[PDB]
Amino acid sequence: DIIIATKNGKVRGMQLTVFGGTVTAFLGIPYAQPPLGRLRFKKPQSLTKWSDIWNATKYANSCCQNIDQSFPGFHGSEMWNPNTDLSEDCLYLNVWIPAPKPKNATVLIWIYGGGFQTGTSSLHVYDGKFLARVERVIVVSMNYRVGALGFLALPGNPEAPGNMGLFDQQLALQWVQKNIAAFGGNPKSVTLFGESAGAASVSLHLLSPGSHSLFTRAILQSGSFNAPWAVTSLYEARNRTLNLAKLTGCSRENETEIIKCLRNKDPQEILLNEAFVVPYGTPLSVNFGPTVDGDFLTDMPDILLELGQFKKTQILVGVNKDEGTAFLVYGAPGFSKDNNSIITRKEFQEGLKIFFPGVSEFGKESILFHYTDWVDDQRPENYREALGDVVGDYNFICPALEFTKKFSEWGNNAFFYYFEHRSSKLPWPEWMGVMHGYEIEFVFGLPLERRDQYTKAEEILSRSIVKRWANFAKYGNPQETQNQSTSWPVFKSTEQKYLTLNTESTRIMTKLRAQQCRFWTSFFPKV
Numbered sequence: 001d002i003i004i005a006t007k008n009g010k011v012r013g014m015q016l017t018v019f020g021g022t023v024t025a026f027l028g029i030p031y032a033q034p035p036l037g038r039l040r041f042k043k044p045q046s047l048t049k050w051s052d053i054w055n056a057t058k059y060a061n062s063c064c065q066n067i068d069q070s071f072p073g074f075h076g077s078e079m080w081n082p083n084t085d086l087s088e089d090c091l092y093l094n095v096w097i098p099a100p101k102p103k104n105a106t107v108l109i110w111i112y113g114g115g116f117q118t119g120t121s122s123l124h125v126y127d128g129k130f131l132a133r134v135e136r137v138i139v140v141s142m143n144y145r146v147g148a149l150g151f152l153a154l155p156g157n158p159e160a161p162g163n164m165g166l167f168d169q170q171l172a173l174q175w176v177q178k179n180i181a182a183f184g185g186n187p188k189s190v191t192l193f194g195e196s197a198g199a200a201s202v203s204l205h206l207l208s209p210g211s212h213s214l215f216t217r218a219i220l221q222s223g224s225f226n227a228p229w230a231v232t233s234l235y236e237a238r239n240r241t242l243n244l245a246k247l248t249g250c251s252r253e254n255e256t257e258i259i260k261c262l263r264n265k266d267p268q269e270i271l272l273n274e275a276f277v278v279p280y281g282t283p284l285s286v287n288f289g290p291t292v293d294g295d296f297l298t299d300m301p302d303i304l305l306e307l308g309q310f311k312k313t314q315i316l317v318g319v320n321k322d323e324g325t326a327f328l329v330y331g332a333p334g335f336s337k338d339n340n341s342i343i344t345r346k347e348f349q350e351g352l353k354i355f356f357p358g359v360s361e362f363g364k365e366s367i368l369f370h371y372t373d374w375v376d377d378q379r380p381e382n383y384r385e386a387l388g389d390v391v392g393d394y395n396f397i398c399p400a401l402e403f404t405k406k407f408s409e410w411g412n413n414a415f416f417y418y419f420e421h422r423s424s425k426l427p428w429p430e431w432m433g434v435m436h437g438y439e440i441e442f443v444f445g446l447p448l449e450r451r452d453q454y455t456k457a458e459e460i461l462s463r464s465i466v467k468r469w470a471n472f473a474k475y476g477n478p479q480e481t482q483n484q485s486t487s488w489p490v491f492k493s494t495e496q497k498y499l500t501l502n503t504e505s506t507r508i509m510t511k512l513r514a515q516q517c518r519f520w521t522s523f524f525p526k527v
């Protein structure tokens, strides 16, 4: 019976047998007043203390969200769907601490992705028990509100100021500061890490002054705020809020009366109508996301990045080899996970209309021009591979490289990786490569469990990544110093060295996607 006294009351954990040892898990600790009734759409409110023993022995409710139904019964998609009850009452977090209880352990705080519309910390691939067992760190993950319930925005209006899901995350970072020393954790050594919209979230905490004292260091997997999907404009946010109001029958003149109207709507009604607020949307559109609210985020983040207005500290940043392919089977013509998706030029052109809906003819032609200079004109997968690279370079690789250059230009150490190992257990087909989100299981050390079906080489790769991440969190340096590993060089804006992660040979390379990213970063933002 492991009981910890937090500042709001006593919580009860559970013991876990991991790798012939023990981890203590505290699953489902509340960290805010449930955002229900009059509290829906508002910022998270402080939690009033309890007097008993809160039983933190099972994952709590996931936040309300729409579910992927494109591949029913297929584990490749359904692994990302929530695995606890959906409920508005979902502001909970989890803590894994090593056994025996540590003295001043470094803390890793996970922020999941899901495009700010989906996700939950209870996913199997976010289980922080191996990190706690193997590296003696504490792992924390929290649920945060997503979609309109988390990011609906009437800027300046506190009834729906926007960015609520980010303030959920922040209130959880605060909880760690006030409480993690009781679990044996060092509040002075906190590393945020997340993937996709979670990585973008982490990058926004580097920008937000209200978060600057709540963490030490940052790790960004496949995401950053300067990605084109990561920030909703004040124009779009308002056009989307009124679109939702109209769809729900909540159109009013008093903008506050609109919110009160949306507060008598059942969560399901808000969920069904959320999808159509964006008229010409992309596959997996970020309908409701971070905005410049004037509170969490005081200016357009690109300007903050460009002008060095962010927390000075070390960053670890990286991307996967085929970030774009997962999105091609959610709308692109001729694509399918059950065949090899050989598409024609015309299919490629339609795909661009699908993924760049509001872009001019000339803009689309410019993308075609930059990506159809084939070495061989007869390789039938030419267009198929070009569409995936287009989506991956524009939405992930180039934004992440530009973040790392810009951030590093202000004097802090930065480390960039390129993950290029396709999991042997990967249920998606081979042509989709090293997909978006499929480094996460290696970061969390699932291949360390031999009872699974990972290869030995995959166990060694995960063990090395796990050590590098942990050495980065504890020491600001993502080396593996003991087993003759390749030294991870600092990423500098001139040389732009990065490290490749694979089962075979770990390599130092320079200037990832240089020719592609000059297009996306220096020409395409003009069109």
Ligand SMILES: O=C(Nc1cccc2ccccc12)c1ccc(CN2CCC[C@H](C(=O)NCCCNc3c4c(nc5ccccc35)CCCC4)C2)cc1
Residues within 6 Å of the ligand: 066, 067, 068, 069, 070, 076, 077, 080, 081, 113, 114, 115, 116, 117, 118, 195, 196, 197, 229, 282, 283, 284, 285, 286, 287, 326, 327, 391, 395, 435, 436, 437
């Ligand atoms: O992620 C969203 N948007 C985007 C984010 C970032 C860059 C993007 C670039 C281009 C287009 C969209 C982008 C997004 C926008 C809306 C929604 C709400 N709805 C949920 C119900 C219907 C519908 C839907 O089926 N959503 C699938 C969600 C599962 N997802 C998966 C996850 C990952 N990898 C995957 C790989 C294989 C398959 C799936 C994956 C990486 C880690 C995060 C989760 C969208 C959700 C997600």
Ligand SMILES: *[C@@H]1O[C@H](CO[C@@H]2O[C@@H](C)[C@@H](O)[C@@H](O)[C@@H]2O)[C@@H](O[C@@H]2O[C@H](CO)[C@@H](O)[C@H](O)[C@H]2NC(C)=O)[C@H](O)[C@H]1NC(C)=O
Residues within 6 Å of the ligand: 239, 242, 243, 244, 246, 247, 276, 277, 278, 279
């Ligand atoms: C801003 O919003 C208007 C209105 O959105 C429409 O109504 C909502 C309830 C929802 O169902 C949306 O999907 C609708 O589009 C947009 O006006 C529409 O614009 C499209 C093309 O841009 C046009 O085909 C529709 O007929 C228009 N419908 C109406 C009612 O005006 C508008 O485009 C949105 N965006 C911008 C940039 O203005």
Ligand SMILES: *[C@@H]1O[C@H](CO[C@@H]2O[C@@H](C)[C@@H](O)[C@@H](O)[C@@H]2O)[C@@H](O[C@@H]2O[C@H](CO)[C@@H](O)[C@H](O)[C@H]2NC(C)=O)[C@H](O)[C@H]1NC(C)=O
Residues within 6 Å of the ligand: 332, 333, 334, 335, 336, 338, 339, 340, 341, 342
């Ligand atoms: C790959 O498959 C896509 C998707 O088609 C669906 O899934 C298949 C696995 C099979 O079960 C089909 O019956 C399904 O319709 C194919 O895209 C279709 O292509 C046909 C003819 O080219 C066209 O009439 C449909 O509109 C397309 N449907 C889409 C895009 O959703 C594609 O042709 C297949 N390609 C290869 C090389 O096998």
Ligand SMILES: *[C@@H]1O[C@H](CO)[C@@H](O)[C@H](O)[C@H]1NC(C)=O
Residues within 6 Å of the ligand: 012, 055
């Ligand atoms: C919490 O767990 C303990 C352990 O079995 C149990 O005795 C107690 O009744 C539980 N309390 C609640 C409120 O569920």
Ligand SMILES: *[C@@H]1O[C@H](CO)[C@@H](O)[C@H](O)[C@H]1NC(C)=O
Residues within 6 Å of the ligand: 103, 104, 186, 188, 189
């Ligand atoms: C934990 O480490 C900090 C410095 O990082 C130190 O100031 C603090 O006293 C330590 N607390 C312990 C060892 O309990």
Ligand SMILES: *[C@@H]1O[C@H](CO)[C@@H](O)[C@H](O)[C@H]1NC(C)=O
Residues within 6 Å of the ligand: 254, 256, 257
């Ligand atoms: C209507 O708007 C005013 C501000 O113009 C606001 O003070 C008032 O509270 C709103 N009405 C209701 C019922 O909230």
Ligand SMILES: *[C@@H]1O[C@H](CO)[C@@H](O)[C@H](O)[C@H]1NC(C)=O
Residues within 6 Å of the ligand: 463, 464, 467, 480, 482, 483
């Ligand atoms: C390094 O090698 C030792 C034995 O040679 C092994 O026990 C350990 O897990 C390895 N660690 C990493 C981080 O690769």
Ligand SMILES: [Cl-]
Residues within 6 Å of the ligand: 083, 124
């Ligand atoms: Cl599960």
Ligand SMILES: [Cl-]
Residues within 6 Å of the ligand: 282, 283, 284, 285
């Ligand atoms: Cl969608």
Ligand SMILES: [Cl-]
Residues within 6 Å of the ligand: 345, 377
């Ligand atoms: Cl051709």
Ligand SMILES: [Cl-]
Residues within 6 Å of the ligand: 489, 497, 508
């Ligand atoms: Cl070098």
Ligand SMILES: [Cl-]
Residues within 6 Å of the ligand: 510, 511
């Ligand atoms: Cl070079």
Ligand SMILES: [Cl-]
Residues within 6 Å of the ligand: 511, 514
């Ligand atoms: Cl260069």
Ligand SMILES: [Cl-]
Residues within 6 Å of the ligand: 518, 519, 523
């Ligand atoms: Cl160019």
